[PDB]
Design an enzyme around this catalytic site. Structure first.
Site: not given
Length: 266
Positions: A95, A190-191, A195, A213, A215
């Protein structure tokens, strides 16, 4: 032909990349619905993709409302892609019907591939096969390591705050954090970001200290942020970690052509 262009009851499609964008060699075409799609094969059938030069590609679903399309290999620089989402009134099952049609044209910029090697703790940036930047880096420490694999560069931020609760890890807990950061380039849903980390310059090049991360120094992070675009590639090799799930959001290239190709229409 009652179309709408993609700028960067029923179901609306939304297509990425946006009309006119220039994107890195790993940018997959993305169609995302505002409703779950009972009839995947139908939705696939209603999506026409043209490429020039022509290249073979194929659909894989990340979840129940998002399909992705990409070649076997990274795009060749120069390619123009046109996407025709001819879904208006189309039977999407149980639908649900396509609310409208949608178009997008985009193009592929330079090959930009940054390899982070845990053996050397350097992230080397390569534009068209040549080394233009070499950045000492510091990744997930052993107990919260950075996953190996190929990541697609997603969005960018001059400043933000990463809050581990977003990923179901309380701030108060041993792997918790709520951190302000500059020049943050996202590379996984996932983060995982590349940076600015002035707090680990000493360690960058020597020792993994982060939650996951990459770094890098303040000026290298800014540099990354200035020169990188959606679709560019970060490849992570040799960590003690796992592999970045193919259905992450920016994990597409970790599924192998063959599993991808075969699709998951049902």
């Amino acid at each position: 032909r009652y179309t709408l262009n993609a700028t960067a009851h029923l179901t609306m499609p939304y297509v990425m990349p946006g009309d006119g964008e220039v994107v890195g060699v790993g940018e997959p075409v993305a169609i995302r619905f505002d409703e779950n799609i009972a009839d995947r094969g139908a939705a696939e059938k209603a999506i026409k993709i043209t490429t020039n030069p022509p290249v073979e590609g194929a659909f894989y679903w990340l979840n129940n409302r998002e399909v992705r399309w990409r070649p076997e290999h990274f795009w060749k620089p120069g390619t123009a892609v046109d996407v025709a989402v001819n879904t208006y009134g189309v039977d999407l099952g149980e639908g649900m019907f396509g609310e409208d049609n949608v178009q997008t044209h985009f193009t592929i910029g330079d090959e930009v591939i940054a390899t982070a090697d845990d053996n050397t703790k350097i992230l080397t940036v390569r534009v068209n096969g040549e080394v233009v930047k070499s950045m000492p880096t510091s990744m997930g420490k052993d107990s919260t390591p950075t996953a190996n694999g190929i990541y697609i560069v997603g969005s960018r931020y001059k400043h933000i705050i990463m809050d581990s609760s977003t990923y179901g890890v309380p701030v108060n807990s041993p792997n918790g954090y709520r951190t302000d950061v500059d020049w943050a380039t996202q590379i996984s849903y996932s983060g995982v970001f590349v940076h600015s980390a002035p707090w680990s310059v000493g360690a960058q090049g020597h020792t993994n200290t982060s939650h996951g991360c990459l770094n890098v120094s303040p000026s290298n992070a800014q540099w990354f942020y200035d020169h990188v675009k959606r679709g560019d590639i970060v490849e992570v090799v040799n960590t003690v970690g796992g592999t970045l799930p193919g259905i992450d959001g920016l994990g597409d290239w970790n599924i192998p052509w063959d599993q991808w190709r075969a699709g998951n229409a049902k």
